[PDB]
Design a protein around this ligand. Structure first.
Ligand SMILES: CC(C)[C@@H]1OC(=O)C(C)(C)/C=C/c2ccc3ccc(nc3c2)[C@@H](C)NC(=O)[C@@H]2CCCN(N2)C(=O)[C@H](C)NC1=O
Length: 165
């Protein structure tokens, strides 16, 4: 089995910025990786294309994936509105870690975050399931549109997304 790779093409106020690609650790968290993979291809009929990064805190993380309410209160998984925490094998080791956002135990949906710092205090409560493979420079560029309270100064969108391999 080969861990899947997905990509996001990022835009800033509609203008193309660049691509971020991710390795999804399906060998360690297959249910969580499959959710993010399928939402990235849109193959269930819904997913990330067109959604935004609603909270970007420089020196911390970029959060996105709310395609139902567009503001960080919504989203849904391919398994239903919520699904369980699969495991916590992987840790928040540094910039580029891809992890699930949640509102409590066993509340994963579609929202995710990309770390731009080591966030070890989230270990064991957010499921880590991938990492940036290429385009950390694009993530760093996105980070410059964030702010201390997370509000973005330009609209940061996933203009396209899908699977590479
Ligand atoms: C998935 C979604 C439904 C959920 O939303 C909620 O629980 C509700 C809708 C209640 C919003 C809470 C909320 C709002 C604004 C914030 C501003 C700032 C902060 N936390 C915030 C948390 C700071 C300290 N931490 C984060 O930014 C962390 C980083 C890791 C990912 N991550 N955010 C979540 O997983 C949050 C913990 N959960 C949610 O965003």
């Amino acid at each position: 089995m080969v861990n899947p790779t997905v990509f996001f093409d990022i835009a800033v106020d509609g203008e193309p910025l660049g691509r971020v690609s991710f390795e999804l650790f399906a060998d360690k968290v297959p249910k969580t990786a499959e959710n993010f993979r399928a939402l990235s291809t849109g193959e269930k009929g819904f997913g990330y294309k067109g959604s935004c990064f609603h909270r970007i805190i420089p020196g911390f993380m970029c959060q996105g994936g709310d395609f139902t309410r567009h503001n960080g209160t919504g989203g849904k998984s391919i398994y239903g509105e919520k699904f369980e925490d699969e495991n916590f094998i992987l840790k928040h080791t540094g910039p580029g870690i891809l992890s699930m956002a949640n509102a409590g135990p066993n509340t994963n949906g579609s929202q995710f975050f990309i770390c731009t710092a080591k966030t070890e205090w989230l270990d064991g409560k957010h499921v880590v399931f991938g990492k940036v493979k290429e385009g950390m420079n694009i993530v760093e560029a996105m980070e410059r549109f964030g702010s201390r309270n997370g509000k973005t100064s330009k609209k940061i969108t996933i203009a396209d997304c899908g699977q590479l391999e």
